[PDB]
């Protein structure tokens, strides 16, 4: 049946034997467990592949008339986002992606830095608060900024939708100093547990604030009055 | 004569008193010494602007049209490239800008990686070759990568076509171990001189490799034979 063509980047084109009704040529290339297929005016190897991956992308692969020059573009679902391109023209070949970063500065100078955003909606994220920076990392579905103590692991999830949520997850073993959290959304209240007993209420504030409360040793009364974080020292002290 | 309007991120936007011939109103605003300028259906202050930078730039300003969210989109010299992109929609703004990245992987396996390419064509540069690694920057005119030792500073420069021509600079001020360069682009070779004697030849091959070959004390004759340069301690010695 066809026959196959190298293609510089180490590729490999399989093209018909023969034409078909309309003079044109079947052109057949597999690309990294992708399988691109296409129709071409001549019987070298040149001419346009197309394909998709399994997150529905649309892999386009263009061989130079004179089989020269590769060009591999990478689409998303739709198959109009210019991704990803490598082109490999003879010896050398290049490859090119691009990111992007968002800076939202809130009205009380807080804010939210985006850098190295992937065309998959991920990348890098950083809160800077009044007194205090949280760093993390951005999906397509949550920012989430972690704090680390000891045992303790603190995150802060922003959903896309801006939604905040809070939760902790202790590797500590003895039940006696391991830390469990509750999250309560109606009142942004990230309520720590310490050997069955409360101990400590975390309240996000709608000023993007932290304020902490303790807990009375009996486990059920709040002593005091909340205190705002000033600084990563108390966040860290309060996950203690 | 006009009338000043109040938008979020403290801009100004000045609309005319009254209408024109076909109902619209004049709509002028200055935004960190840029003119921009407009006509809009309203008279609130809403609507589109428009103007230029010194780089003749394309600065858009569209304002809604009930006054909540200004849109600032900056273009290149045509108006059609999305460069970057605030938007301050009542208490808080978010800025948006991009970057790219090329990765070029020669055939012998030496690489020129460019990260965080602006859209002045600027960025940041990193040669690997075989043995070592140069680091440096990239703009629309060259990459510049830099090697220093003590005073001295070589510079190879790959022009935007791919043209290699390297440069020697030496803030050492006695002219008895003050380097001096001379570049040779028919034999792409870096000539230095200390004392009015030449004293090293520095030939960056079409191998992408450097090699070294010395002087003799006369300063006119080459002795022994060049020699390939395998690691960065080897280029910073032939700078001392």
Redesign the interface.
């Given at each position: 049946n066809s026959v196959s063509v190298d293609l510089p980047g180490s590729m490999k084109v399989l093209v018909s034997k023969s034409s078909n009704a309309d003079g044109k040529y079947d052109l057949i290339a597999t690309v990294d467990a992708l399988e691109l297929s296409g129709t071409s005016d001549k019987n070298n190897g040149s001419g346009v592949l197309e394909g998709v991956k399994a997150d529905a992308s649309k892999v386009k692969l263009t061989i130079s008339d004179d089989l020269g020059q590769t060009t591999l573009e990478v689409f998303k679902s739709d198959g109009s986002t210019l991704v990803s391109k490598k082109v490999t023209s003879?010896?050398?070949?290049?490859?090119?992606?691009?990111?992007?970063?968002?800076?939202?500065?809130?009205?009380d100078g807080t804010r939210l830095e985006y850098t190295g955003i992937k065309s998959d909606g991920s990348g890098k994220a950083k809160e800077v608060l009044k007194g205090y920076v949280l760093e993390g990392t951005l999906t397509a579905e949550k920012t989430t900024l972690v704090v680390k103590e000891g045992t303790v692991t603190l995150s802060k999830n922003i959903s896309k939708s801006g939604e905040v949520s809070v939760e902790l997850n202790d590797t500590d073993s003895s039940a006696a100093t391991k830390k469990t959290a509750a999250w309560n959304s109606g009142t942004s209240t990230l309520t720590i547990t310490v050997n069955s007993k409360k101990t400590k209420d975390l309240v996000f504030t709608s000023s993007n604030t932290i304020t902490v409360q303790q807990y009375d040793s009996n486990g059920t009364s709040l002593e005091g009055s909340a205190v705002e974080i000033t600084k990563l020292d108390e966040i860290k002290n309060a996950l203690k």
């Open positions: 003879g010896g050398s070949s290049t490859e090119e992606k691009c990111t992007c970063e968002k800076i939202i500065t809130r009205a």
